[PDB]
Amino acid sequence: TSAAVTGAAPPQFDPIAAEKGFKPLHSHGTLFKIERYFAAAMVPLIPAAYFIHGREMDLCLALALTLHVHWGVWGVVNDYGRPFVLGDTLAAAVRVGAYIFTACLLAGLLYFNEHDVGLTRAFEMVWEL
Amino acid sequence: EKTPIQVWGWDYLMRQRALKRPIAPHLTIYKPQMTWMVSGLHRVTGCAMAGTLLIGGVGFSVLPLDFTTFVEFIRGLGIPWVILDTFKFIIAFPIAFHTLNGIRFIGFDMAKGTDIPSIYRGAYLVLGLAALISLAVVVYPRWERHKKATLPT
Amino acid sequence: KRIKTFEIYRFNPEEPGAKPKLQKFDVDLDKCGTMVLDALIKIKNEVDPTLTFRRSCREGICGSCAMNIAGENTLACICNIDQNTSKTTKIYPLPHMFVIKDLVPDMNLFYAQYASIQPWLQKKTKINLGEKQQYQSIKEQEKLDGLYECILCACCSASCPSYWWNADKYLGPAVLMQAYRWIIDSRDDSAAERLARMQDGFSAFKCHTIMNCTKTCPKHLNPARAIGEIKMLLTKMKTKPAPLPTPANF
Amino acid sequence: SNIAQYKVIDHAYDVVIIGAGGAGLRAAMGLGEAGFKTAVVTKMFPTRSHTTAAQGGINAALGSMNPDDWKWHFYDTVKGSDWLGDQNAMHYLTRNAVEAVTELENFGMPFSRTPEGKIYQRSFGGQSNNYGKGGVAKRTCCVADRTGHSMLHTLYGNSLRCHCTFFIEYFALDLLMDKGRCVGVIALCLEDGTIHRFRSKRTIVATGGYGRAYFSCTTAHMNTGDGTALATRAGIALEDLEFIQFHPTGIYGVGCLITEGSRGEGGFLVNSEGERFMERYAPKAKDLASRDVVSRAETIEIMEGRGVGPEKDHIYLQLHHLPAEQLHQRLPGISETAKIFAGVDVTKEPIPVIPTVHYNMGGIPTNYKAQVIKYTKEGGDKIVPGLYACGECACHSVHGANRLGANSLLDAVVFGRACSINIKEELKPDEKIPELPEGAGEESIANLDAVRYANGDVPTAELRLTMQKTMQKHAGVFRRGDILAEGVKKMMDLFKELKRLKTTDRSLIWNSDLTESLELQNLMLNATQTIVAAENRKESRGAHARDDFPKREDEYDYSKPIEGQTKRPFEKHWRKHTLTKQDPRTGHITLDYRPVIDKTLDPAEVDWIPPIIRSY
Ligand SMILES: Cc1cc2nc3c(=O)[nH]c(=O)nc-3n(C[C@H](O)[C@H](O)[C@H](O)COP(=O)(O)OP(=O)(O)OC[C@H]3O[C@@H](n4cnc5c(N)ncnc54)[C@H](O)[C@@H]3O)c2cc1C
Ligand code: HEM
Numbered sequence A: 001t002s003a004a005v006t007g008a009a010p011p012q013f014d015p016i017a018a019e020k021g022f023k024p025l026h027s028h029g030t031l032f033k034i035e036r037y038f039a040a041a042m043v044p045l046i047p048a049a050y051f052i053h054g055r056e057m058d059l060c061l062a063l064a065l066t067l068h069v070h071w072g073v074w075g076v077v078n079d080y081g082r083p084f085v086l087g088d089t090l091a092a093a094v095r096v097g098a099y100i101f102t103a104c105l106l107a108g109l110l111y112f113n114e115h116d117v118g119l120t121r122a123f124e125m126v127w128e129l
Numbered sequence B: 001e002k003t004p005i006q007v008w009g010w011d012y013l014m015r016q017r018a019l020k021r022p023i024a025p026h027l028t029i030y031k032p033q034m035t036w037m038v039s040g041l042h043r044v045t046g047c048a049m050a051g052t053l054l055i056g057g058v059g060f061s062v063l064p065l066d067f068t069t070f071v072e073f074i075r076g077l078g079i080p081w082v083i084l085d086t087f088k089f090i091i092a093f094p095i096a097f098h099t100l101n102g103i104r105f106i107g108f109d110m111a112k113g114t115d116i117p118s119i120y121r122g123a124y125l126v127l128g129l130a131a132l133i134s135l136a137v138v139v140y141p142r143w144e145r146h147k148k149a150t151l152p153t
Numbered sequence C: 001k002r003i004k005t006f007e008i009y010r011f012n013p014e015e016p017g018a019k020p021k022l023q024k025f026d027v028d029l030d031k032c033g034t035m036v037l038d039a040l041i042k043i044k045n046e047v048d049p050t051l052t053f054r055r056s057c058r059e060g061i062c063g064s065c066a067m068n069i070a071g072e073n074t075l076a077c078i079c080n081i082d083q084n085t086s087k088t089t090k091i092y093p094l095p096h097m098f099v100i101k102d103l104v105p106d107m108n109l110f111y112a113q114y115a116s117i118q119p120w121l122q123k124k125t126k127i128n129l130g131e132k133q134q135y136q137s138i139k140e141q142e143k144l145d146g147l148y149e150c151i152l153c154a155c156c157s158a159s160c161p162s163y164w165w166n167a168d169k170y171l172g173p174a175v176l177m178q179a180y181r182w183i184i185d186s187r188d189d190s191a192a193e194r195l196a197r198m199q200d201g202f203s204a205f206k207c208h209t210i211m212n213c214t215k216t217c218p219k220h221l222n223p224a225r226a227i228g229e230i231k232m233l234l235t236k237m238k239t240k241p242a243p244l245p246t247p248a249n250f
Numbered sequence D: 001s002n003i004a005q006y007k008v009i010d011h012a013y014d015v016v017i018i019g020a021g022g023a024g025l026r027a028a029m030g031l032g033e034a035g036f037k038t039a040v041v042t043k044m045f046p047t048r049s050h051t052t053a054a055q056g057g058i059n060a061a062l063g064s065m066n067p068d069d070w071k072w073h074f075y076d077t078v079k080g081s082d083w084l085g086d087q088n089a090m091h092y093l094t095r096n097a098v099e100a101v102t103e104l105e106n107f108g109m110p111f112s113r114t115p116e117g118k119i120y121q122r123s124f125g126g127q128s129n130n131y132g133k134g135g136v137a138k139r140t141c142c143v144a145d146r147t148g149h150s151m152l153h154t155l156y157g158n159s160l161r162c163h164c165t166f167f168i169e170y171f172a173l174d175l176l177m178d179k180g181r182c183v184g185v186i187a188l189c190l191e192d193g194t195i196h197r198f199r200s201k202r203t204i205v206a207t208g209g210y211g212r213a214y215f216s217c218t219t220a221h222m223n224t225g226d227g228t229a230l231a232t233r234a235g236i237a238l239e240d241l242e243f244i245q246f247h248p249t250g251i252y253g254v255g256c257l258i259t260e261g262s263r264g265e266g267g268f269l270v271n272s273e274g275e276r277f278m279e280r281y282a283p284k285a286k287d288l289a290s291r292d293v294v295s296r297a298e299t300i301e302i303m304e305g306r307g308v309g310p311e312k313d314h315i316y317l318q319l320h321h322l323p324a325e326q327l328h329q330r331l332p333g334i335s336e337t338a339k340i341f342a343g344v345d346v347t348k349e350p351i352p353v354i355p356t357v358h359y360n361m362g363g364i365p366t367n368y369k370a371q372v373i374k375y376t377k378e379g380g381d382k383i384v385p386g387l388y389a390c391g392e393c394a395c396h397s398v399h400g401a402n403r404l405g406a407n408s409l410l411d412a413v414v415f416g417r418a419c420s421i422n423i424k425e426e427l428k429p430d431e432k433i434p435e436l437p438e439g440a441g442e443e444s445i446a447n448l449d450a451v452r453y454a455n456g457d458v459p460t461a462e463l464r465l466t467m468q469k470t471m472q473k474h475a476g477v478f479r480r481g482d483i484l485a486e487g488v489k490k491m492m493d494l495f496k497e498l499k500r501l502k503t504t505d506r507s508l509i510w511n512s513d514l515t516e517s518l519e520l521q522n523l524m525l526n527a528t529q530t531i532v533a534a535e536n537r538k539e540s541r542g543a544h545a546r547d548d549f550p551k552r553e554d555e556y557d558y559s560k561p562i563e564g565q566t567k568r569p570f571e572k573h574w575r576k577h578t579l580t581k582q583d584p585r586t587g588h589i590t591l592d593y594r595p596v597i598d599k600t601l602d603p604a605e606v607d608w609i610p611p612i613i614r615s616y
């Protein structure tokens, strides 16, 4: 019977009420541009590192691969490090881990260049097999 | 800092959790297609190449082992020649494909080649050339090394 | 006797501890229309009236009946049934949406995200409402071709893995392509503010050019092309042309 | 209301709108603009509404293609109505057509354009320049082949600014009446089973048509006459329901509409002898004659062994002679629909077509201000306090005996807006929201419960299919007094089988078995009232053709001169609106008749148009 309760409006997005104090200016535009421009600039740098080896290419690969992969994994991490599925703090801990990944990647590459054969050399040596 | 809709969207997802509603299947049910299989590959490769560089980089530093003994170890295993060029091809393909496909996806970011034929040409092309180049780079030295095993000179 | 078999995703929220499940249904193709909606209605009418789906038009214009048929996101009402009866066509809801019941997915985020692009004409110089037609040339209106046709069925967004993982923050192809549809509307004065709304790293930029959206679209449309077009505009690689000027006689 | 329990939720709104088609959203925009706390109740997401499926165009004398007058549009509207139409409502419509359509463009509606940058217009069926004297008119403003789709999406979008609050997928059960006065609507929320009572000062009924009453139609599955069932159950008699528009070119196998615009760009109909037969049935207008004429011409050609296809039981709309450039630019929607459903390349082949139930001139009666009315001989028109109605569900009556192509989308916006204008001006902030009666809506719940748990041995889908087959057979393009009478018999039987109803799904949550049976209830009311009104009209007018009463029966015989005749009394002639009043419990239907409003709103602005012999 109609002895029941007063109800509220269904949940609905008011796109004008959202405009009442939506200042934030945070263009990810330029960053998206460099990420792509940097990858475009790495197109020649792959065949280059095939034909010309050494300790200076080893350094250019390491600087370039580090900075590229840094952006790369940050993106993958944001697709699979979702607060919905992992909860808030663990998703921030996965985010932080992205930076650990970048910084450890470089450390381990510089080490391999300096105190071992180097990237371009290590490739030859598996190719010689 | 989220947009107002992104705040709204979050609450939505929470409301949905509250209602104990299932999520409709996706990966397990969606048709494999040249679209998302190749972007699937672009992510796999990019990540496996990262992973290798990190494991490889940090591994050979944290272990007392060096690269030269590691190369010597598997040589000492005296494994068949064809199988060794397969491992080389697997190493080379990810580099060839991801690089090639990377320019394809940059084209997509610029709205180039996004019609369905183009999509499917660039997919076969980029996938085809990658395989081609990886074969060339694995088989060219082995043709140059069998040119010394038996040879005119 | 040409008996086709359909596997249809089921879910009943009324039932306690209820789980989703696949249900097979046999259909005599010689007493049933040609499109998969016709099987769904037949099954509801003759076999099982608990079978639940959205539908309205018969001609693939309303968008009500989007769902996953034989792996792909399409419309039941214009999806030809697979004659080959040694196969069993599978029928699931739109991927990765919370479901209300059977093949009926909760659709209100999709609609909210649609609200957020402010899908309506805006003018910096206030116009007098009923009085006259705003000028727009043919070519300028033909930039709307391929854009205004969208029926808001959500096949494309529900096919997009980027959108599966981040519905709450990535806007997805259906909404983005509409966002673009007001951006290139010569008559609309608010390109700047519309682009501002999707400046952040997720809104538009989470489009990882997977291209599923443009493959699956049952109206043969191209969200992916609009999204690339949006990214250019966001990065300032391109800008919207200024509206052709309205002649003095007009 | 016994065998189960129901959660009930109360809301207080200024005005509740039932429907979000072209009309409902237009009203919503007007109200929210003007400050009102407006709710929009709709059984489907607004975009899915049938308006979205409209194709050909919307009529306005913009004179973008050649000079025009709205008074020419007024004429064609009235003539098309076969003088059953109310000229004051047709006046309001056509006067306001240029503004309304321009408003649409101003809302962002992406109309096709001409090289001068104005709104493109096509020719359409049953319109003319200079009062039937001049040539074939070009008033039909379009967005190619998808004019409705665009209009609705334009409107829906623009409604997200009026802060109008949407209750989506809420099935309306009944108007809440309090001593002859509507104080709101009660409804079932499909998502969560809850029953909702909306307290409102005004209620607008904008629910669309009842085309699913027939076996074959162009209408949506959702076109189940719910709004007129609402009005019936509220003790409101419905108007002109026997006037069912058969659109000439629906696809033969399926029902899918092919737009009149395809004829308006130079397409034509073709029989088996390879004749463009419309030059015989209509020498002046040909394949752009009025819908009721062309659909008959077709129906005869079948009857007389000139039908096409294996069974020789339909005809060809032939577009292939037109250039691909035009075919693609003006008719891309039907190109693809012909392809998908009839396996036809329209550039190379013809489309199999056949007269198909399409539009409903009849509905809830209103005055020219869109206010629902009751009628007696003694009292005359008497408004129902609080209730407005517009769109296809209504009968103003702007189409009378036959709707003119591209007048419905127009009708929906003009009077949709007109609702908001008329409420702004009659509603004042002094009058507060109606507190409900005690018990209000209790019966609608009782009905729900009974239908939800329905026991019987006749399933809801079966009883719907016989209703549809009956209607098709006994109330089609041509009708005879005995087939009708037998049809009325069989139909009043099917109204009994409602008591032997069988539903199966027992859930409250998104139960479409339940709702599709509430739709079957609502359809039976509409259909029953349709056929007995049809049985009783011993004349032929507009879409209602009687083989046994071929003539149009007016107060005078307008085939011969006027001076020297005796006006037949109301009771003898038929130029009068049918009013069907049904007891919803018993199913019994009475009749009555209400005069046609011949006068315009303002004779100073435009004269009325006396009846003549309708020829195209
Ligand atoms: C294929 C086709 C093409 C057409 N083309 C044209 C054209 O080109 N030009 C033209 O002028 N006319 C055309 N028409 C006619 C015209 O489109 C319709 O008559 C008009 O759009 C009706 O609009 P409406 O707002 O009255 O209701 P509709 O658009 O029919 O929508 C009705 C609304 O009411 C709601 N509703 C119904 N029942 C209930 C309930 N019980 N509870 C809650 N809500 C309910 C629905 O959810 C819906 O939103 C066409 C019709 C068809 C089939
Ligand atoms: C040589 C030319 C290269 C180009 C042009 C290139 C281009 C790109 C582009 C455009 C993307 C982003 C596409 C997207 O968002 O889905 C990307 C992602 C990535 N790249 Fe590269 N890349 C190159 C080489 C490399 C190399 C050598 C690595 C080595 C580890 C690498 C690792 C990655 C990773 C991890 C990602 C993230 C994957 C994803 O999110 O899908 N790339 N690359």
Ligand SMILES: O=C(Nc1cccc(Oc2c(F)c(F)c(F)c(F)c2F)c1)c1ccccc1C(F)(F)F
Binding pocket: A076, A079, A080, B027, B036, B039, B040, B041, B043, C161, C162, C165, C208, C210
């Ligand atoms: O869907 C994409 N990969 C993908 C495909 C299949 C499985 C997969 O692992 C999962 C998974 F199985 C889960 F159950 C998860 F809960 C999860 F979090 C995953 F990550 C990722 C994908 C493919 C191409 C480009 C971009 C994507 C991306 F990034 F994610 F958007």
Ligand code: SF4
Binding pocket: C149, C150, C151, C152, C153, C154, C155, C156, C157, C173, C174, C177, C216, C217, C218, C219, C220, C221, C223
């Ligand atoms: S784009 Fe194609 S798919 Fe995505 S909504 Fe518009 S129509 Fe449906």
Ligand code: F3S
Binding pocket: C156, C159, C160, C161, C162, C163, C172, C173, C206, C207, C208, C209, C210, C211, C212, C213, C214, C223, C224, C227
């Ligand atoms: S499917 Fe998804 S990520 Fe971009 S191009 Fe297509 S939207």
Ligand code: FES
Binding pocket: C054, C055, C056, C057, C058, C059, C060, C061, C062, C063, C064, C065, C066, C075, C076, C077, C078
């Ligand atoms: S039911 Fe309208 S899109 Fe299929």
